[PDB]
Amino acid sequence: DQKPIGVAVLGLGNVGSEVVRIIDESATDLAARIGAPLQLRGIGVRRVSADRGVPVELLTDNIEELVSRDDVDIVVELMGPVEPARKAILTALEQGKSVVTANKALMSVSTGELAQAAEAAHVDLYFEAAVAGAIPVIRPLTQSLAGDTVTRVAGIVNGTTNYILSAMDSTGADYGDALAEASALGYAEADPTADVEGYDAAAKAAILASIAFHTRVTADDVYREGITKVTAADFASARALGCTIKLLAICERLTSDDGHQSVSARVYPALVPLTHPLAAVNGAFNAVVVEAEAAGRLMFYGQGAGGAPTASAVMGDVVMAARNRVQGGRGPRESKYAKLPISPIGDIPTRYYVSMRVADRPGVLAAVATEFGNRSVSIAEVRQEGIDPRGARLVVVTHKATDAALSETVKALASLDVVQSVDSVIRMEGT
Amino acid sequence: KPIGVAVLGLGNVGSEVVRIIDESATDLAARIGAPLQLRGIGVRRVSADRGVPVELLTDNIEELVSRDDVDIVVELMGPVEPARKAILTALEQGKSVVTANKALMSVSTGELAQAAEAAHVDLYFEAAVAGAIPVIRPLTQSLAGDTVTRVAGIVNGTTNYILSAMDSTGADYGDALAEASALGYAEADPTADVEGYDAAAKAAILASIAFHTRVTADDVYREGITKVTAADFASARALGCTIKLLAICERLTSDDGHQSVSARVYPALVPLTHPLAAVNGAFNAVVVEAEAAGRLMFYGQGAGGAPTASAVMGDVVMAARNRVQGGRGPRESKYAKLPISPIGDIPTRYYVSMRVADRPGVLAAVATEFGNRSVSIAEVRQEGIDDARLVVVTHKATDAALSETVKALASLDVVQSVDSVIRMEGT
Numbered sequence: 001d002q003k004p005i006g007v008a009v010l011g012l013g014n015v016g017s018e019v020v021r022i023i024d025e026s027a028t029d030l031a032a033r034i035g036a037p038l039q040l041r042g043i044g045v046r047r048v049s050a051d052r053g054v055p056v057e058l059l060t061d062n063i064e065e066l067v068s069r070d071d072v073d074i075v076v077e078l079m080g081p082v083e084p085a086r087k088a089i090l091t092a093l094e095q096g097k098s099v100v101t102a103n104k105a106l107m108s109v110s111t112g113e114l115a116q117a118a119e120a121a122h123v124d125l126y127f128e129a130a131v132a133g134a135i136p137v138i139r140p141l142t143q144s145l146a147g148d149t150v151t152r153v154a155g156i157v158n159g160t161t162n163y164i165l166s167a168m169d170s171t172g173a174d175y176g177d178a179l180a181e182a183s184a185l186g187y188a189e190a191d192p193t194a195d196v197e198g199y200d201a202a203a204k205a206a207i208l209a210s211i212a213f214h215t216r217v218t219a220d221d222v223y224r225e226g227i228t229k230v231t232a233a234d235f236a237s238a239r240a241l242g243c244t245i246k247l248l249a250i251c252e253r254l255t256s257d258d259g260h261q262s263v264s265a266r267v268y269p270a271l272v273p274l275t276h277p278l279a280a281v282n283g284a285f286n287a288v289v290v291e292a293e294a295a296g297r298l299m300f301y302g303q304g305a306g307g308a309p310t311a312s313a314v315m316g317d318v319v320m321a322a323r324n325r326v327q328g329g330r331g332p333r334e335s336k337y338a339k340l341p342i343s344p345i346g347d348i349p350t351r352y353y354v355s356m357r358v359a360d361r362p363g364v365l366a367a368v369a370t371e372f373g374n375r376s377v378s379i380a381e382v383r384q385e386g387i388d389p390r391g392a393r394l395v396v397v398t399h400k401a402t403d404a405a406l407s408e409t410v411k412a413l414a415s416l417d418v419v420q421s422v423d424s425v426i427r428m429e430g431t
Numbered sequence: 432k433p434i435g436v437a438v439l440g441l442g443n444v445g446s447e448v449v450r451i452i453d454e455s456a457t458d459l460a461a462r463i464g465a466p467l468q469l470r471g472i473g474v475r476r477v478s479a480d481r482g483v484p485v486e487l488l489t490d491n492i493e494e495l496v497s498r499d500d501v502d503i504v505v506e507l508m509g510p511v512e513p514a515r516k517a518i519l520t521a522l523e524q525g526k527s528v529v530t531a532n533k534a535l536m537s538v539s540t541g542e543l544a545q546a547a548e549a550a551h552v553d554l555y556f557e558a559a560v561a562g563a564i565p566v567i568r569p570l571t572q573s574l575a576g577d578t579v580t581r582v583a584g585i586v587n588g589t590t591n592y593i594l595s596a597m598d599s600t601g602a603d604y605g606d607a608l609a610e611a612s613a614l615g616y617a618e619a620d621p622t623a624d625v626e627g628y629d630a631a632a633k634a635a636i637l638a639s640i641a642f643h644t645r646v647t648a649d650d651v652y653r654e655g656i657t658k659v660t661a662a663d664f665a666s667a668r669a670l671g672c673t674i675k676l677l678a679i680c681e682r683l684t685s686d687d688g689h690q691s692v693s694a695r696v697y698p699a700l701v702p703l704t705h706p707l708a709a710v711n712g713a714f715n716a717v718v719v720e721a722e723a724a725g726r727l728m729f730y731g732q733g734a735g736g737a738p739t740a741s742a743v744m745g746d747v748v749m750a751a752r753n754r755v756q757g758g759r760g761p762r763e764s765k766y767a768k769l770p771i772s773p774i775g776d777i778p779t780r781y782y783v784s785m786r787v788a789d790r791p792g793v794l795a796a797v798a799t800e801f802g803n804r805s806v807s808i809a810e811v812r813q814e815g816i817d818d819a820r821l822v823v824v825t826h827k828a829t830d831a832a833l834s835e836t837v838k839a840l841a842s843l844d845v846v847q848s849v850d851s852v853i854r855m856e857g858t
């Protein structure tokens with residue numbers, strides 16, 4: 001006696017369309033892998049029409065009725081908005097329905113209330129598709145690395161910003177021309193703000209940090225800096241220093257001198273040495289680096305955006321949720337046991353690349369050096385040359401120090417007389 | 432209530448496992464929901480010079496796996512028959528089992544999985560494939576809603592360290608293998624590695640996990656690196672390639688719709704621009720191609736006591752979580768019953784290095800031999816030796832045709848000897 005498992009898909013856009021196509025075209029495999037048939041009950045949408053690749057009788061705009069049906073077992077939330085999403089997720093869990101979602105912004109703001117609700121109803125809540133599109137990242141960090149100690153999660157989690165920077169690195173194009181080409185070729189949107197400013201990265205970083213270090217981290221905890229201040233000159237200096245530039249999401253388990261642990265989650269442009277694995281990740285692809293104590297360095301690479309790869313991840317969650325209902329017993333449980341404090345950006349040890357225009361006098365380098373040393377910052381590399389009998393281009397790369405000390409050093413350099421301007425400031429990671 | 436652990440086996444993996452159970456007790460207990468307590472360590476030679484408290488050591492494996500205060504049995508013994516025996520007894524006693532045995536999983540999963548499903552109990556084996564790289568769980572759970580078509584890459588740390596050394600230093604196979612054994616990257620009898628048994632067992636497991644069918648080691652074509660020379664790497668560099676021990680697992684589809692599976696491990700010239708060409712040292716890398724997901728790559732350490740212990744502990748936490756929360760893992764799904772495609776049917780390319788007569792006619796003879804079996808040549812290089820060296824690279828063609836041509840070449844009068852024959856993948 002194998003009772004079918006009902007599925008309600010909310011959304012028929014880029015991801016939902018692919019999810020429904022798979023539930024259709026792979027029904028035999030899916031059923032065989034779940035143990036019972038996987039039967040689509042209805043599709044939540046706003047526009048109901050016969051021109052949506054599905055029979056209209058499946059389409060509905062009443063989402064609350066669709067997730068409330070008794071012959072529905074799993075609810076797949078693939079609508080954009082967060083308030084409709086949360087309302088659907090909650091009403092569905094309350095009725096004992098397993099939930100699969102891909103909603104970055106909802107998960108990055110509070111998995112606490114939703115996870116508690118799924119635990120109460122004794123049902124699953126899977127959101128693998130929320131981070132890294134098709135790249136399995138959440139399940140490896142919650143299950144495969146559960147017996148280990150993760151210390152660093154870092155990688156490229158935004159395809160648009162990686163395509164733009166990869167393009168600036170290859171062609172020497174200016175940011176504006178690279179963004180234009182990106183928009184034209186369909187890699188960026190009419191308003192790419194969520195990408196180029198780093199909001200998409202910050203949300204994903206909050207989720208990754210929470211999963212990796214067993215603490216609650218929200219998008220509001222993540223320091224955010226985008227790529228709009230990255231220039232072609234920056235890439236030229238980076239190349240001269242053996243680096244490229246990438247928009248990194250970094251999640252670190254930090255330890256202070258007094259021994260207490262904390263968690264950092266931050267996104268910003270970073271000079272990355274060409275030898276680093278992330279430097280070879282180009283185009284719109286994503287890659288996630290995980291440092292653990294017993295396992296060492298792991299890297300997961302693939303497509304972290306798109307209807308088809310995201311659907312792959314959704315369907316993996318769906319099959320697991322259906323399997324759990326067939327055999328009884330849920331999947332993992334929320335592990336936020338650590339209650340680690342959040343380290344702000346100023347406490348984080350990092351390195352600064354600083355590019356300035358300075359007077360072409362033999363004492364200026366001593367002046368800037370003192371400004372770094374007076375705050376206990378050591379200099380690793382310096383490059384100085386003239387511009388065309390007027391001034392000099394002074395590049396400085398520091399050793400590691402707190403972002404606070406380096407931020408204050410920069411402010412100081414700006415106020416110096418010999419410093420005409422501080423043209424660029426970019427952190428440096430990898431090394 | 433506590434969860435009892437029994438580690439069968441010590442050494443590289445078992446030592447790290449025990450050390451982690453002790454040093455990470457607080458985190459492990461708080462991630463499981465109940466304390467994780469080591470009950471005993473199975474071993475053959477019981478003594479006090481094994482870096483672990485002696486009271487824990489015991490040579491009666493059957494007693495250890497049958498204890499009531501045990502709950503998970505971590506099998507980390509070498510041989511397959513004592514492993515199968517202990518696994519079965521532990522499962523029949525209602526104990527979840529975590530193993531890392533490649534040879535046991537690659538020869539027979541049927542009886543073991545059935546015994547575990549009957550006793551409503553887990554049988555995890557992530558540590559069997561790719562050391563620390565999580566590969567089995569992604570293919571069994573994350574990609575379960577997808578259709579995987581190809582799984583391939585570097586899955587042996589020892590062979591990969593030897594070849595990488597041969598590529599960096601120009602060393603001969605014997606010297607590199609000695610460096611590896613001396614530095615601890617290989618072992619006293621590296622036969623399991625250098626001849627391909629390790630890779631072929633892992634490939635059997637990968638194919639069966641990815642294509643939802645039963646694939647055993649007896650179905651995997653196996654060729655090692657013992658015949659890879661420094662002169663091979665010199666040619667490969669000249670041809671814009673390196674050499675790597677590749678495992679490949681493909682879902683093949685015919686014109687009529689018949690599906691089949693091919694699983695094969697062998698040496699291969701790979702272009703330097705290929706991603707696998709950058710996987711050096713003892714690292715591994717697994718590439719998965721699926722219909723929705725597209726292409727994925729998993730990179731990490733594939734050999735080592737601590738990396739493999741990491742995978743083992745991942746499975747132990749999950750098996751302990753399940754026993755606390757009353758559940759299980761994904762049932763074994765080998766429903767496709769796909770037939771096995773032999774090697775002759777697989778399209779590939781050959782690099783063939785020969786010593787031939789130093790006369791201007793030999794090239795036409797070798798070419799006709801290739802052509803009469805409908806094989807186009809992509810590149811040739813010919814020069815003289817000092818008291819003629821002929822290198823040929825073919826286009827794609829079936830392994831069977833290429834084998835027939837090689838035989839024909841060896842039997843040719845103008846061909847003094849076939850010195851090296853290596854496939855070429857990637858491209």
Ligand SMILES: NC(=O)c1ccc[n+]([C@@H]2O[C@H](COP(=O)([O-])OP(=O)(O)OC[C@H]3O[C@@H](n4cnc5c(N)ncnc54)[C@H](OP(=O)(O)O)[C@@H]3O)[C@@H](O)[C@H]2O)c1
Nearest residue numbers: 011012013014015045046047078079080084102103305306
């Ligand atoms: N696209 C990607 O590459 C990607 C990657 C990772 C994660 N995700 C996440 O996946 C989710 C879906 O993205 P998508 O690209 O599929 O979005 P989409 O293309 O904009 O489609 C959204 C779908 O949801 C429906 N919908 C929206 N608001 C609704 C509401 N209030 N009530 C009922 N139905 C509603 C829409 O119906 P109508 O067509 O009638 O308006 C449409 O079918 C989002 O949370 C996104 O963050 C997407």
Ligand SMILES: NC(=O)c1ccc[n+]([C@@H]2O[C@H](COP(=O)([O-])OP(=O)(O)OC[C@H]3O[C@@H](n4cnc5c(N)ncnc54)[C@H](OP(=O)(O)O)[C@@H]3O)[C@@H](O)[C@H]2O)c1
Nearest residue numbers: 440441442443444474475476507508509513531532735739
């Ligand atoms: N080593 C690696 O890097 C690695 C990586 C991935 C997977 N693996 C897998 O992990 C497993 C263990 O490998 P390993 O390198 O840890 O091996 P190992 O160094 O050779 O240790 C084997 C252990 O098993 C015990 N043992 C052997 N035969 C036994 C028997 N009949 N009854 C009871 N105990 C027995 C031995 O005890 P005594 O010392 O008293 O003889 C020893 O402690 C293998 O299945 C291997 O394929 C290993």
